[PDB]
């Protein structure tokens, strides 16, 4: 049987923030979340988050999903623990602790971490890494057979110990029983305490401690200050967008295209750079996304083409093109062949198969019909200051361009809207409506106008 | 003499993809054009490019470029390279063998490995790179002379061989004539047959085989995946734009801007990070371009200043201002001094001399004379749902804000199109023409309103 | 007492650019001011700036910062020196030379390396660097007990003397009295001469000549071409970015955001990637810029959330919402809460708390009241070919969508313009204005039109 023991209960105060430090996010999730999604490949019997700073904000985040204990104030990570030990207390297995602050760390890592110590019957294995600028961290001190002696701390290290490169990371597995039978050892003969001085008890009763090392230094990150937070979101990124490119999603640049952890692409995606997809997004088979492409929680389908446009809680069928520049607000279905052009605005709206909107046009709480064309500068105008209405227009309607459509109307089937008019009634089908003043010329009078070139 | 066979027969399984692996696309062009351009330094008497999966769409890229030849089925490299043999049997030179999928080795680089080849009178000189982590690759190995004595695959490497760190790069130059002989040799002695083999046989027969270090070992990418193939876009990017800084354009974030291989910049332009310059562009002395600037095939010329805009198969003349957020949609010509605001979008139409269209315009299908203004707001009407229409506007006309113009219908010079009004029929020079219901007023009745301050 | 004398009098040839070297951007302000900058952290009694190309253009960007001298032309770097010895000379003290083009040498360098040299007694300090490239660089020969022996040019360097790592970096500091003193007997020696040339003096007079060598070799690029201004950029960028995160600032990206030297970022700002921000910009705590956002000179308050939009000179309260792809042009002032949605411009116009413009809308000229609303469409019209007018617009006016205001005019407190309307006059408070044609539908005719099903 494996545990795991998540480490939330602090604030982060380099953070310069009032959230729990491990709820800043990365690639869309807290990093709190990375933690718990890499420790469920331990395939953990229990998993114990130790919560302390706002930790009903942190209990929201994982509700369900993990039994929570509160450590009252900050009396180290060896309180930490202890905080778990009337859940964990005499239980048979191996015991994973790990900080919501290295959200880099992999499952696979965890696996390996896992099985290095049950296969070395270890009591204790830390996991460690190796960097060429050591200055900080915990030293491991190993014998000439490799095993651990001791974790040396900064402060305290001689100044051969100084060039150790391997270090600890922070992160460990124990044998459950002997952890809580030592941290109680500890806790008795006391006002901070330290998980690591339970690696100096199995030092004392010779008990066996081993150091698995993580092949790529990066994954150690723990994430004090916002500096170490966008290096985790780069690390992050380039993780997730090799995992697309792999599966057959191109990258103009994936160094500098911003997708979540959770979004999904279909094979054959063509993406240029600073495209953002945040949420629960899915692109279909060949869709094309442009640079400045921006989409929060939508489904777009298969052979569309997002030009440099922000779509957000829609749906977007098979073959659409929006953009550049076009703005699909929440609540929006773009039917399949839709097109929406430059500086158009769909909100709250269902648009059917083929209709067109090329420009300079609101949709706002519409039904609309298949094969609709709204010529440029249409507005569809929804609140009066307390009434949002809807506005329903059959198929194969034609809305003249610069045509003001006020709800509650309906324009029927193939109805057609003269440019320029103010729509105040509904349009049967197959009716025109104009709603404009007609024009008046005067000759010559321009001449008396400051644009005319003589007064110029 | 030289002679060049360039290997684009491969599908790529791993791109995922349809396309032959070779016409996936770098700053602008197929990878295989990338080889074919490099190989051009050598000048060769003649090229020939073996080509199997979907061959058609390979010799439309290279059409009239390259001989081609077919080869049936993937029976390796030795089998590609016999398909050249009715073409190149015979020949005295010296032949390379390039395949169409690295597409960073550069001409220079070519040249340097047809000249050391010639200068060593080697038999095959194989192009290598060096690298500290070899795993995976053909390894060379030398005596202490420097002679290539074999090329050791992954495979079959003794533990010692695992170690060597100059690998091939899958690149050669061959004695034409006993290219040819060798090869014959390999394919009556037998289902696959590898170019690598004619090196086995050159060693049997004591001939000299030497072997041509890449200085940069980024020029030996093999692009398998679009992983890959993002890391070609990478490099490459870099390799533009400091030609482009060296000649005196200025870059904000030369790796975060996203210029094609045949974009061409007058000394003194200054671009933003984030700009993207696409096929036939030209960007004139001066010329700024602000960040989310996106030109596709389009002149632009001297002292413009375009502020994130997207230009696409049009001409920009001196010192024009368009953006920021302005659609210039193909075949649109602005016309020196040109202003083009946010929210505008040109379509098709010829613009004048020192015109402006500074705010939420569609101009479509119109030519427009010179010192023309077109107040914010102001619609163009070409399409009816079957004709598309012309509109022509004379100089020194003012289009007032929020008028609908309803082609086909000439504005004359010098004449006003009142603000607000729907145009249906020509305006002569020098007349004004007005075409809106005029205000009316009820006094006190707001306050029945849900806008009202009371009613709130 | 410190002195300083930075060099300035170069044209820069690589550059391809009539600009003096020096003058060219970094993070918004030129290579010169950056190092004037870092001059300033040791406190120097006098200044001395060296000018020669365009001179005036210098004496512009530094003008009652420091003294200048001329050099009328390009006779090296001790004739430049020599321009300052009327200022300088005889003075006791310890004289800092560095060129204008070094921007990425810090305050903190500069201090370390006059410590250095008041502390060592040095006659002359010469600020080095060590590199794994040194092909082209002086290089430093020490002997044994580290002082400097002398500086060999790559041309003049012997094999042995190429393998040294460490380089001159063209900076120095030297005894004051001494210096003057040495140039003079260079000078009366004899056309070019070298600051170099005063360490080879004081080699014949035994006199101590030190190094202190920089901690990061980036700190020494001189900037020669446009491909070394875009490393100063991205060295410069990752510096204020840095400053930035560690105040409390989140970034997506911070090697891709885009922020000059001298803006100021609350706490708790959240920054996407790919956000330009330029000039005496402040932004306040908590307030969210996402990707393409673009402020020029611009104050944004607390708790803002800027959505990919451009503001220029303009002044942003709290809580304010701007964007998809909006405006804020100069001279305008957005109350507390207002929000400016997509395909929005507002330029010269003070807009009250709460007032809403979500839409299409030009807002030119105009000063407006509180809670104001302005449907997608309303278009202000302010300019007549001459004229410029402005629009008073009182508070809770609620002006109908695509409606047409046309300056002068005023909007009385809760009056209504009915949608559609051309507004030529004025509303008195808790009216409303109607404007438009009335609608006329005629049944059936569509059948007549080319957008009909049947005519399809
Ligand atoms: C050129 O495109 C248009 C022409 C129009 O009138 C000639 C009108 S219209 O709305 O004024 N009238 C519809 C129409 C279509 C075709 C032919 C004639 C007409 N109208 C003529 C005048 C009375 C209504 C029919 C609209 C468009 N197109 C757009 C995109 O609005
Ligand atoms: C303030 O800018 C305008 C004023 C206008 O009327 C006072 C009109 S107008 O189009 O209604 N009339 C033209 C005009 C210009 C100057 C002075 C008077 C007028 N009109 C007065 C009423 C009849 C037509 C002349 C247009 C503009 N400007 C824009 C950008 O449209
Ligand atoms: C549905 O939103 C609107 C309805 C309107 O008329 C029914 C008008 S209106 O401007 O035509 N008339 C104002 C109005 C508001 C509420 C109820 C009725 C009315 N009008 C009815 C007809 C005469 C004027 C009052 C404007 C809006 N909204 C926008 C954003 O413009």
Redesign the pocket.
Known sequence: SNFAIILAAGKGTRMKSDLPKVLHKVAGISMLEHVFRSVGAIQPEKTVTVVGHKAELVEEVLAEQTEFVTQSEQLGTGHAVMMTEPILEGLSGHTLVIAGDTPLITGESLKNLIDFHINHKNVATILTAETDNPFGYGRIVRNDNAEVLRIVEQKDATDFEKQIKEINTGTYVFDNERLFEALKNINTNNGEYYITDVIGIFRETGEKVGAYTLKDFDESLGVNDRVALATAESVMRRRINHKHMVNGVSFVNPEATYIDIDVEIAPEVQIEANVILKGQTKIGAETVLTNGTYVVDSTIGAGAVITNSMIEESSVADGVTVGPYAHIRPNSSLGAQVHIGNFVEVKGSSIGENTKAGHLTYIGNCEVGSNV?F??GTITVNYDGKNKYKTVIGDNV????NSTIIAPVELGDNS?????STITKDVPADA?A?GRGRQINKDEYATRLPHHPKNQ
């Open positions: 064309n010529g440029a034609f809305v003249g361009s057609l809207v003269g440019a320029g025109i104009i």
